[PDB]
Design a protein around this ligand. Sequence first.
Ligand SMILES: *C/C=C1/C(=C/C2=NC(=C\c3[nH]c(/C=C4/NC(=O)C(C=C)=C4C)c(C)c3CCC(=O)O)/C(CCC(=O)O)=C2C)NC(=O)C1C
Ligand SMILES: *C/C=C1/C(=C/C2=NC(=C\c3[nH]c(/C=C4/NC(=O)C(C=C)=C4C)c(C)c3CCC(=O)O)/C(CCC(=O)O)=C2C)NC(=O)C1C
Ligand SMILES: [Cl-]
Ligand SMILES: [Cl-]
Ligand SMILES: [Cl-]
Ligand SMILES: [Cl-]
Lengths: 492, 492
Amino acid sequence: HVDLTNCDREPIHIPGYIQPHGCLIACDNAMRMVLRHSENCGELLGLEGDLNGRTAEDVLGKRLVHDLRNALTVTGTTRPAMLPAMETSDGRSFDISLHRYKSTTIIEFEPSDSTQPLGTARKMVDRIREADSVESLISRTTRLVKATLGYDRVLIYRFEEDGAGKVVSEAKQPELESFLGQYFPASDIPQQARALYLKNTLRIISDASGTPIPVLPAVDVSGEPLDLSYAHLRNFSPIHCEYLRNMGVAASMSISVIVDDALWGLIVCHHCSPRVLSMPVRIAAAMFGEFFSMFLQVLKQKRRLDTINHAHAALDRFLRLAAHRANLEELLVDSFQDFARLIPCDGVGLWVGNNWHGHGATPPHDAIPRLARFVASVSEGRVWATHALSQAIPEAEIYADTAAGMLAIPISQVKSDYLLFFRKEIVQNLNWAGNPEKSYETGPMGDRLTPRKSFAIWKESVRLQAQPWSEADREIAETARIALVGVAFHHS
Amino acid sequence: HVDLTNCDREPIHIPGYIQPHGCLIACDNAMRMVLRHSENCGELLGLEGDLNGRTAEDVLGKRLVHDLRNALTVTGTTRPAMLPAMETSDGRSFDISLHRYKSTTIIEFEPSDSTQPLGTARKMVDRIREADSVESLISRTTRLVKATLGYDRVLIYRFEEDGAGKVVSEAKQPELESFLGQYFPASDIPQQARALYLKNTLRIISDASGTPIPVLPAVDVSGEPLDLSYAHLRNFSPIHCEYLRNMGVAASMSISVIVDDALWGLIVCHHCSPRVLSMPVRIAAAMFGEFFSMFLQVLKQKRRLDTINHAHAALDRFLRLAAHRANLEELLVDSFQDFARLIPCDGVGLWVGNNWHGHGATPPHDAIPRLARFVASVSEGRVWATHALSQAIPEAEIYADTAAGMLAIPISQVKSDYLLFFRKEIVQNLNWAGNPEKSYETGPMGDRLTPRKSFAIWKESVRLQAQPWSEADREIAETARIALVGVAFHHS
Ligand SMILES: *C/C=C1/C(=C/C2=NC(=C\c3[nH]c(/C=C4/NC(=O)C(C=C)=C4C)c(C)c3CCC(=O)O)/C(CCC(=O)O)=C2C)NC(=O)C1C
Ligand SMILES: *C/C=C1/C(=C/C2=NC(=C\c3[nH]c(/C=C4/NC(=O)C(C=C)=C4C)c(C)c3CCC(=O)O)/C(CCC(=O)O)=C2C)NC(=O)C1C
Ligand SMILES: [Cl-]
Ligand SMILES: [Cl-]
Ligand SMILES: [Cl-]
Ligand SMILES: [Cl-]
């Protein structure tokens, strides 16, 4: 059905099963007729037999059906309508999620559990609005979510440029192992999963060791499956199921962090026992996720601003000194190390008049002329940067542990003079806070579905590679070029 | 051959003619054989008969050919090699431009006129490096270029988002008419022209009323024309020829302003008499163009930074006031006009609890509910902006003279409350410094090829449209949303 070969392309949006903590009824575009339903619809709503081919008013009752249909008008959108505490025909009270996607009305029922959403959320959002840095926001959010929603572990996953995830914050029970500073490969969250996570803010798993409920029909006469993209009861991949089971995790709740309309990362809650949050608590958690997302976005913007301002101030100081020095070359020889304040780097060097001066982690004196010649050939009077030097210069491999990434800044419009910034390979700068000799119980699919193997797979994928140069890094580097080229032109 | 219907697609890169101020010889990839040559090659180099099918060493002489070939190695690139003051076989001295494109070596000859390039350029670049604003750089550059290169008119053309050009700076002889603040449509510089302008920094027209020199063969046996994309002697469209002649302009020199690898605009020099600049003066002008480009880029970056910082400071002041006010709605009613400092706008309004408050140029009280309802339908809790309101709401047309553009900011996560920013249609804000009753002598193609008709055509194209909202505008608007939504959530 699915394994480690075709799970990168697994159609998770159309599993044909839901989770047992609720029941689902699929109706036509207009919600006149019941096209599909979950096997457990009878056991929960107290109805007998097959509901398929019956009318809406027949199953739910004219009273309820009218309220649902009017909530679709107020909706429009694919964003699901939340209707807490609604009465059926036979009195029973349910929390109802209602959405419409691919002209099919999907209705999800939960036994109602009536918390005030606005109250819980407002308390949480107040405690994060004060945060003055990305670091202060992310560190306090895991601590706050764990305290409020009472999960055993709360992680924040940040997606790197390569799609890999880094655990950037953690609140856990003291007995559980830490994943803080641990990376996981892009493959561990395939593209189709990232799509749904971008479409649904919130994502719940009541019981990883739960019995999934089939949807009937599993496929319709057209050969069309039920697309559960926006359904909160949508069942989960048996691959991820096995991953959570191998970890000692029985329940999960993830929140999507959207920043500049991109999946930035996930707030992920793990529980060691089964756990469902009521619709009200979910509404609050979702509201919190939106505000967390918005606040992180502004802090990201503020951080970028400060970095570029700091770089502009640093370069002004330099240009001021260059006006009061006769010989610019000896100023650059005295000053080049100070340029390490502009761009995060493990080392910086000056290649001027076929002479080399290094500071921090740089290639050995031997390798610099070869590097300088290479830079001169491909630079073309512009900033040149790679995070994978060995892919460009295969003999660079020998010193990757010291310098695996390089950003080159030409400092002369004419002569082949360069300011070089270096970064150690990413595995050298690992501040892993986890357990080396902590092993995991495996399942049918093998030891691939453990954090130990995931981390080991990622570490292999980034061998001989440094932290990629951010757009901020390349923007500053370009501003630094213009400044140095500009003042170098003045001194002739 | 070409007219006002097929000149938007005119193949200007392959005209099959050069300008009479130099001679051109096209050779094979290796520069072993003369494949094509200009008709005037004989009259300038003092050679007799057809040069096509002869060898390189035969025509130019083994001595010269060796020097040219070694300059291609040092080159590589499509960027043309400049070789001032070179001796032919018969003593004659020439300035030689040498490039290779589509595996065809093109050699351009000018009678040498030996200025020091580095000296002229360094003097010019020094006078612009001090500029502390975009406005100070652009205003002094026309004045400086005119003073140094002695053209009759120097304009700077800035390209708008729609491809239209605005004259943002001018230095002219006092008798000539001013084009300052005048716009021209995108069509006046077709896409294929903008491509070449992005490939060649400098572009010269010695004589608009000059006799073009044919290249022989005009087309080769393959059916391939000579691609003169990087040739400085490349002849110009007869459409533009007629434009310059209608204007009283006999010679032109344009410099490409590249900012963030995009054609930002042109430094354009017009002369009323024929005028060619020697290779040295061109080299200097080109160097100046690169530094002008780089300096404008950093100033653009600095301006963006300051604007976003100023917006962040303004919003901090507001959030501070909102903490010390009980009722946020009345604070917004007292304060909304102050938000006009964040985003350039001719008017701003507050739509709160189905009540309207306006300040500056806004739609009439009548039209606001219709607008509010429209914004509520399409906004979807996000910043919504248009520069062409009538295209979205056709009855808006009536008040376009007051408000033709609108940027909407939702200030509530729940209620349909909005902060609206308005801009008058662009023709209302015209500070044209030109002559209304100044008419132009027309040619075969008609009065279309006059600044009077170009301006009139542009004014038609931007009717009922305001100045588009810049990315800076929308970035601030998004930061303002998060702030207002954030503090509105706190007050419940
Ligand atoms: C070949 C397919 C695989 C695969 C598919 C899926 N992963 C999904 C969700 C998911 N994966 C992770 C990854 C982790 N890696 C770790 O090392 C680690 C913890 C130490 C985790 C948690 C995460 C974080 C998530 C989502 C959040 C979470 O629950 O933690 C999904 C979609 C699940 C869904 O609910 O729809 C698919 C499909 N995972 C693999 O490992 C492989 C090989
Ligand atoms: C249908 C084609 C047309 C056309 C084609 C070309 N224009 C070209 C250059 C060029 N046009 C302008 C436009 C101006 N519009 C003004 O109102 C105005 C002055 C008041 C000007 C100068 C400019 C500025 C330029 C280039 C710089 C310059 O010399 O001023 C070209 C390419 C020319 C070349 O050298 O390759 C083409 C082709 N122009 C039209 O007007 C039309 C209809
Ligand atoms: Cl589809
Ligand atoms: Cl600076
Ligand atoms: Cl081609
Ligand atoms: Cl702010």
